[PDB]
Design a protein around this ligand. Sequence first.
Ligand SMILES: CCCCCCCCCCCCCCCCCC(=O)O
Ligand SMILES: CCCCCCCCCCCCCCCCCC(=O)O
Ligand SMILES: CCCCCCCCCCCCCC(=O)O
Ligand SMILES: CCCCCCCCCCCCCC(=O)O
Lengths: 250, 250, 293, 293, 241, 241, 49, 48, 55, 55
Amino acid sequence: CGYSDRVAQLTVGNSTITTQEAANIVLSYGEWPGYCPSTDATAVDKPTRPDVSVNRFYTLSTKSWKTESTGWYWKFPDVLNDTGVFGQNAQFHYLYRSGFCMHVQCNASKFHQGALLVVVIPEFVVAASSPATKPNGQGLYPDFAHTNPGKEGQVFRDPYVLDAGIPLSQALVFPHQWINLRTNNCATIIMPYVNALPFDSALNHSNFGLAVIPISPLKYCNGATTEVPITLTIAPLNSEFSGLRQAIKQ
Amino acid sequence: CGYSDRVAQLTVGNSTITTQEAANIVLSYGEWPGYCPSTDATAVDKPTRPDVSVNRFYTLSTKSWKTESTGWYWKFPDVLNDTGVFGQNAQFHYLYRSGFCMHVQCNASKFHQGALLVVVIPEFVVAASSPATKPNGQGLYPDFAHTNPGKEGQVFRDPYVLDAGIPLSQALVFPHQWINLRTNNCATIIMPYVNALPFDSALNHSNFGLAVIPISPLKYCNGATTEVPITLTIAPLNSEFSGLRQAIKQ
Amino acid sequence: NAVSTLADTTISRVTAANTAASSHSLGTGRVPALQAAETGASSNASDENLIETRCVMNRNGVNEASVEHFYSRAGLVGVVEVKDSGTSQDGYTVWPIDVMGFVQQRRKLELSTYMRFDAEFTFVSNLNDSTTPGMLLQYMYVPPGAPKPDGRKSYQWQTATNPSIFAKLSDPPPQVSVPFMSPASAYQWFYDGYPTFGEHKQATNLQYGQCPNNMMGHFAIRTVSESTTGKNVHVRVYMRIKHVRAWVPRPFRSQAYMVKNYPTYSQTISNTAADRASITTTDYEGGVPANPF
Amino acid sequence: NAVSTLADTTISRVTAANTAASSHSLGTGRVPALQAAETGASSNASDENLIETRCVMNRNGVNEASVEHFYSRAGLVGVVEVKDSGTSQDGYTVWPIDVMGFVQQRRKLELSTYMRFDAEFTFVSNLNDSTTPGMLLQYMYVPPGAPKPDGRKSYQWQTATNPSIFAKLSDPPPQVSVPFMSPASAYQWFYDGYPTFGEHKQATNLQYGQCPNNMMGHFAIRTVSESTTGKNVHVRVYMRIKHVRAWVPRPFRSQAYMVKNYPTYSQTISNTAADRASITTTDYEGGVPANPF
Amino acid sequence: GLPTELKPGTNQFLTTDDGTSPPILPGFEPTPLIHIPGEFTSLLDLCRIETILEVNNTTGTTGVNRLLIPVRAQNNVDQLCASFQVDPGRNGPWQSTMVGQICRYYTQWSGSLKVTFMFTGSFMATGKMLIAYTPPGSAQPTTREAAMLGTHIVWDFGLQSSVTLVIPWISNTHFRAVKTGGVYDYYATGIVTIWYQTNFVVPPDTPSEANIIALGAAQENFTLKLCKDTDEIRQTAEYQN
Amino acid sequence: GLPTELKPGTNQFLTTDDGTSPPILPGFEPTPLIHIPGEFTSLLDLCRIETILEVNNTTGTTGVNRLLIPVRAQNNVDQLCASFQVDPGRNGPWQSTMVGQICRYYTQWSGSLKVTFMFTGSFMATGKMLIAYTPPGSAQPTTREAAMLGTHIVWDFGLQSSVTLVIPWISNTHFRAVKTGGVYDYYATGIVTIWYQTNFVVPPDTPSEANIIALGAAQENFTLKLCKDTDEIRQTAEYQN
Amino acid sequence: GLPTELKPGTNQFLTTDDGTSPPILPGFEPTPLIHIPGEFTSLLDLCRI
Amino acid sequence: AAMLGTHIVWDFGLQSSVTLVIPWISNTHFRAVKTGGVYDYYATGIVT
Amino acid sequence: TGNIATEGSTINFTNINYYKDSYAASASRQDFTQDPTKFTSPVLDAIKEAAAPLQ
Amino acid sequence: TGNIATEGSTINFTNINYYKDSYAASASRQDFTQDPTKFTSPVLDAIKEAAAPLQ
Ligand SMILES: CCCCCCCCCCCCCCCCCC(=O)O
Ligand SMILES: CCCCCCCCCCCCCCCCCC(=O)O
Ligand SMILES: CCCCCCCCCCCCCC(=O)O
Ligand SMILES: CCCCCCCCCCCCCC(=O)O
């Protein structure tokens, strides 16, 4: 063809996401999610692959976008670590690995405007800003709420530095996609398992951060619908759990 | 077959040991005792091989196992250096070499319990424990009775450190076998000649220490036979003596 | 043979992409300029399609923008002070091996998330007056869980197994090759998680972000002496990464760092770009326009 | 030729044993789990038979758990003090060559009963203030029965046949290769017997356990001077075993050593394992159980 | 072989010397390397990523607002919308781009740069913008008629929200120095000004002010030279965290 | 050849440098090597030997008693018989094993471990024991129902007095650090608990209390890395015997 | 190879010594050489003017 | 709660329609048309 | 074809490892790789230059 | 197949003896041997894994 079709259908497990304004799908680092090969595998326990049970689209969080909204982030797999069969497999097992299919849905009329950058940041170490007054302010280490927001996600306090002391302008280095209410209304990022280790604990370690930041603020004329939601839908892909024991929640 | 038979018969010289609970025979370092080859031989005197006269089972020491017994050890060939034709060949000659077939016999009823570790320790240098009070206590060097117990053997004072400052737990590194009164009633260790020199003085140097240590103490209910003996039977194999002179006893 | 092998060892010149000659394109349907940043892909448009270009056979070399070349340069990673005077007469110091201590090296390495490299460590050692007398020093690498020395003369300096380096301050700086030492398959400057299970409900969440896959033990450094020398020794440790593979590029840090092992920034946000008077103001005088058209 | 020989000199990677994929085994007759420790043999049971394993093509290297690698590391075996001040103005010392003096090296070597190795000896020499002036020193190896020097300037330092090493403290440490020197076919850290015939009825049985097959002479060390220098010199001797064969493994020593040439332990028996409150007590917090099932 | 003579450079430690050093751990085999996605081997790969230019780097503007070029319906034709110089080294809008930050690790650079402009008005908003690039000789064009004489693209807003102004490599030298200002204005690359070709037209009940997001990168012919330490980060002294 | 220049690392003495030194005795031929039984060339051979675990490493217990797990007829089902962590480095029952002592000479370890349990009750004594291994996430199971969800073996006492619990290598990393505690609890291997599957049943006139002897070793896939000096022995100072 | 002995002339700096020195910039590729008229390679060419 | 069952996210655009295929997830090969009472054994499900 | 900035090749006795461990070797900088697409064009539907990207 | 932790082999001028005595040579660590049986299974009757050891 040589052009990305506007209309697109994403079907994983017993869930289907249809979008009529898909601006193409990003495949992070041009690599598809796959099961750990024999050569990379270190751990001798046979790994359970629940397939359709865990590999399906989960619609976890919807957020209201406002003119002064600063942005939201989630941590994968932390966001899903307590939802559905995935959550149970993740609590019951030690080692964990999967890629995911992100899909951020934000529609507005042809008379609204604004741009959301949706970016997947591998190893998103949330920083804590210390007030200039004291060199070691108590808020030098971010509390558990900020590092692991869970399903509800967390509001950025300083989205300019992506709450990590790195410029948002250069965040486009990570797998990203824009939602221009002018052109599109969804952002899809397929991400393979990215980690130095072949399997990691779902609970202790977060492979990726999912950040939705409004660059161009949402603006509209009096009379349009003020409530414009942003919905995060995530589908784990090629999930593999190992090291079965007593279910542990975080 | 792929399994060790329970019932076993050991015939060396004019002596035969029959056992109906043999837990297999240990061949130390997977090497059989053999005569010194021409290449390893340093000493030009033709070596006497008395064969059946010296190579036969000698039943030297029987010990009464009690609930608080701490263990016994012997030194080979010191244990046999005064018994039978072997003893005479060992006194009359300077150089000496042979492997041996250990066989520790300990039967008890199906209503007694306990475990003896029987282990052959090459170069078993008996230590002397010095009391904390004085740094150089007179008992810093073990007297001749402890280093060379002879036929009667010597009681361990600290079997936990095998009276040598090395943990008994790791003694299983040496050729060993257990006597579980549950399973078996004999322990056989065939040991080849292990020394840096091809021939050594039987009297001055002890190639191996024979240690029987009760790990699990002997326990039984009122009414069972309290007297449970442990008998050491040793058969030198491929004995070779050289350098004939006046008989010297130790 | 292996002779032909030595001949082809000089770094060869890889050139940059050439430009092809292009003419005008007055047609509908073909629109190289129009892109869609929303898709997440960078513009695919070339110079030849936007303007009329000439043929340029570009001979500029690209061999130096490599992760090998970028990082294969020794930088200061630690300053160990072996105090042996005044209140501090220990005459030994145990320095935790970390490369996140100094901005210039930290910021370079944090371009990547994961890196697998061998390093070369050089010890430039001297006194307060920059003098290097005939003074013997022991540099002992103490891997994680090896006992750390508690005194100038302790048993830990026997080094039956710990690798140590004896050198005089007088000698040229000691240097050694160190392998890729890490349980994980690569190092990891950013670890988004906790090393232990728990609920992490501490008024000070220190444990967050600290992967021991990176912590590679200590270097213990002493003056091999019997008593206080009454002289402090500065040991500048220089690390030159080599055999370098890097994964997942990240934004270069903008904010000034505050602590060693934690990305943390002052609540005063320094802008990435130095500001100017107005959005239509440029600092360039240029020349005198011929028709003021 | 000998070129191909140099190509294959880099230590090659030997991998560890791979795991094969396994499924469930619901049959009688086949019992991999059941063993008999009484036989004296270690369990033959593999992971694949006890649990369902996946295929793992293990690429972990085993080349470093070798008796070559374990022991080919220089460790402190002696400290010779060449006293030339105060009461001790000899300006020479004769040090009996023994490697059983310092725990870290002793304990490693006593893993074996017999060992045959060449060694490399390094002499790190310096003053009390860790300073290395231009001070000339003579290290003379005195084989067993060679006359030992009785004075700073005696005839024994002519070294017509004794190997000696002249070096300044100023120079990098002297090093030499030493062969396997022993009447016996291997060295022997444990000798269970007496070196002489007799009845051994002494209130102090010193002779027990002392094989002269190990005693390899002395090193005599002097400052090549005419008179008292008024300075003491410390000579740390470092031995790196090489070309190493070892026989009959032994338990690693648990108890602290007391004297040099005799296994002897305090009547206070330090337990091999650090004790804990109860047999059902483990020090691990773990995480918050999801169903407290 | 045995007769040797030491030349100058002995006992020195050049930090950028590529040499061998004795290994500290005989027979050490490192952890097996597993496959990790997103390996990069070159920093010119990193330069060809579009990242946001901080064109609104003004006294007042703060945070994410600095990344937006404001646009609106004009009462007067041919007013200047924004303007920025296109030398990555220079303190200015290029500092916020990965290309601008990698350039400051090198002394000299060459090849075409690439600015992508994404418009983020409502679907109903239409307009045309003349994005002109002026080669080094001239000042920032005072009128649109001055600018149109340089390399320019007229950009029409429609379904495709983005356009790309390739800044061609027009240099006397094969490589420009990253350092600029003073005698180093010899390597000034030029200015890029955005003019209104027509007005920003909206229907009733539509916002009449929107934003353009500029994304800077480098083309395939882009090259760097002479690795040097960056200006962009500072700790207090040699002894700090 | 003759023109040389000395690089950093000259005049240094790295203890673990594998080099040549001049020989002190020209033409010396060592004693001929005779054949000695029990040559070992690898320390992984030494790790695959079963040696006794000091599971009863408690305040009170002394000497050989520390090597015995006591068992007895229980009035109550599903009580915890014993429990130990399975990381060889950790101060605890593994210190008494050859594998545990060789691990402390290395920084990192990998591969399956192996615990063999030999029962030493009377022939007439019968019983079943659930020996469960819990992977790193969880605490020591408080009930048998918690433990059964991990890798376990039910062991029946009979003519074969021993059983083997292979502890499978379930690690995120290819190698665990031997050092544990603090942030190094990241490499915690897990806990092994022994529960009564049924009771320890004896007839009249038989002892109702016996012992289990645990023997720890390593499997064929076991590997070590990064030789370091051990913690396990200490003299007072650098100048001692 | 390993056994070496330094001869006179060591640690000296002869200005007209033609030798190698370690390069300060790994992997540096200089600007391409363009054709410039009036290259001279010899000073005897300059003497014949 | 609902997202954990067979679902379709439907975006309004030029195509005004979408199709939720209700898959046949039954224990039995055939459900009875009659429902309510013990016949709630053959309840097909809810669509929200 | 080197960085000599003049005609000449000479003889190249360089990149020699003098130790049994291969990680002791000089920086491995013989090979240069430039694959930018995994970061610049990670989309599934490859877009031709000419064609308008969304249709 | 070395410990370099990246693609590369280079040239290996190592393991050279410069003295007439061969015991002057560098540590002989080219060869690795793993024969554990002489210590782990020294029994005469080899026992198969499957079979119950004593019968
Ligand atoms: C005696 C001196 C020998 C040299 C030994 C050097 C050992 C260095 C270990 C490897 C260094 C790279 C890892 C650095 C990671 C630390 C970063 C951090 O987590 O803060
Ligand atoms: C001038 C210096 C030359 C070096 C000569 C070194 C000679 C060393 C002899 C070989 C050392 C190994 C044997 C050690 C045995 C001693 C142990 C003991 O019995 O206490
Ligand atoms: C000490 C001998 C080293 C030999 C190294 C190879 C030299 C080959 C001669 C040609 C120069 C290399 C470049 C070329 O092939 O033109
Ligand atoms: C001074 C000349 C030394 C020559 C050493 C041999 C080098 C052979 C070239 C190939 C590199 C070795 C490893 C391999 O065979 O791939």
